[PDB]
Design a binder for this molecule. Structure first.
Ligand code: WOA
Length: 460
């Protein structure tokens, strides 16, 4: 039985509104309703991995696992294995996989982050799951961010707190947060970003939804506008939204949006909004294609409709040669030429690089680079041809071209990362000097750039 080079992943996000689900939720796992939906001809075909994120979940882990497994079994006649379940308050993530994947999945991690202080600490935050599927690292974050149209700044802060403090993936990758730790990272939930239009426009918005005319609404979506000004989810992707706002509905129908202010809302309007979202970030030049993104029409127990997204995701096998793992393959080398970092920092310390990759026995520290002053104010850190020669554990080009090098630039004085990025080894040529580039981030904010040339030697 050959190891797969592709898997499909189902991502679900549902704010259940503290109500039990209805008896049938199969439409969710089948990607049926509104938006980019799944072909009918695929209905009996199981996804490899189902990741289910809930918010305001009133069920026990036991109660929800029984409904999920029975749902997938009715759809597929396959009995799914539980990989992981983690709950913080009423925020839950469940990971289910086909039984044939049980021995492909290892290094399962779960964590949570509680956002806010005193007043604002008590029910918002994120749960997460990571694991290895053969040679590919996968991370999943379900977040319930701060509610309310006037708290987009708070939501952006909630995001930064989750990506700094969620402890998933390989702890040896110490300079790197979850936005660099995974081949594929999926981040979903009730992100709670609203359509920022005047309250007096509520009926006009409802009219536009009934005409399936979403363009004017999406142009005011706070998550789209915050992302365009690089305030949040920098370097993440989202599929185009072609489904009605998923919040806020009257329960037991989908025919009415309940937007007017009420004691129960803290006298806040809830204009129809895309609260419920799926974004992803994969390493450069890895296959990832969104094959569905939409909302169900027939699950009406909550004031939110469930959202689904499915993805094709590139995966690699666990490689073993005569040499690595457990030694170097003298045939392989990675060389960096004419390299420099450009940093936004106002500081003056010396900087060195760290190279981290699963293709190395352990991370590699460079010599300090030479600081110069950029023509527009910037710090430029020159490495020239000084960077060490990296010694991969395996030289086979079928392995090595599928790998990535994570880069941290660190202060010599403090050993703190000023910037993190990622370089793909999926080059156009081997034994050839080729341009490389990555932006650099710290705490998910843009802090600089790394550029230069690479020269990759494989056994071919
Ligand atoms: C890493 N993805 C980038 C691609 C370029 C455009 N883009 C975007 C799209 C809509 C709203 C705001 C930003 C991104 O996020």
């Amino acid at each position: 039985q050959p190891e797969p080079d592709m898997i499909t992943i189902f991502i679900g996000t549902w704010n259940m509104g503290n109500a039990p689900p209805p008896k049938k939720i199969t439409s969710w796992f089948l990607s049926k309703g509104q938006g980019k939906t799944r072909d009918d001809s695929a209905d009996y075909i199981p996804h490899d991995i189902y990741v289910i994120g809930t918010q305001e979940d009133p069920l026990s882990e036991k109660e929800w696992l029984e409904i999920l497994k029975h749902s997938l079994q009715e759809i597929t006649s396959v009995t799914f294995k539980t990989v992981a379940i983690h709950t913080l308050w009423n925020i839950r993530i469940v990971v289910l996989a086909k039984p044939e994947h049980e021995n492909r999945i290892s290094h399962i991690c779960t964590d949570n982050v509680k956002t806010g202080i005193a007043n604002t600490l008590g029910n918002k935050g994120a749960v997460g799951v990571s694991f290895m599927f053969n040679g590919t690292s996968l991370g999943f974050v379900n977040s319930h961010l701060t509610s309310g149209s006037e708290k987009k700044l708070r939501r952006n802060q909630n995001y930064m707190n989750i990506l700094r403090f969620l402890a998933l993936g390989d702890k040896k990758l110490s300079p790197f947060n979850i936005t660099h730790r995974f081949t594929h990272l999926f981040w979903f939930g009730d992100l709670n970003y609203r359509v920022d239009l005047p309250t007096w426009e509520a009926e006009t918005i409802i009219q536009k939804i009934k005409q399936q005319q979403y363009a004017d609404l999406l142009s005011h979506d706070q998550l789209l506008t915050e992302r365009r000004e690089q305030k949040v989810f920098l370097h993440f992707e989202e599929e185009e939204i072609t489904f009605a706002p998923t919040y806020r509905f009257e329960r037991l129908t989908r025919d009415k949006y309940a937007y007017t202010k009420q004691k129960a809302t803290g006298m806040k309007y809830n204009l129809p909004s895309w609260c419920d979202r799926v974004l992803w970030k994969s390493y450069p030049l890895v296959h990832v294609v969104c094959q569905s993104y939409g909302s169900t029409s027939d699950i009406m127990t909550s004031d939110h409709s469930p959202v689904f997204a499915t993805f094709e995701a590139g995966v690699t096998s666990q490689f073993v040669s005569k040499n690595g793992p457990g030694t170097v393959d003298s045939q392989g080398q990675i060389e960096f030429l004419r390299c420099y970092a450009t940093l936004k920092t106002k500081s003056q310390t010396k900087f060195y690089l760290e190279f981290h990759s699963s293709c190395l026995e352990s991370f590699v520290k460079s010599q300090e680079g030479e600081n110069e002053e950029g023509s527009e104010g910037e710090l430029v850190v020159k490495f020239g041809e000084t960077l060490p020669k990296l010694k991969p554990i395996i030289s086979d080009p079928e392995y090595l071209l599928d790998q990535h090098i994570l880069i941290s630039i660190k202060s010599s004085d403090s050993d703190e990362s000023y910037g993190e990025g990622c370089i793909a080894l999926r080059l156009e040529a081997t034994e050839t000097q080729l341009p490389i580039y990555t932006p650099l981030t710290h705490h998910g904010e843009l802090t600089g750039h790394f550029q230069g040339e690479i020269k990759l030697q494989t056994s071919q």
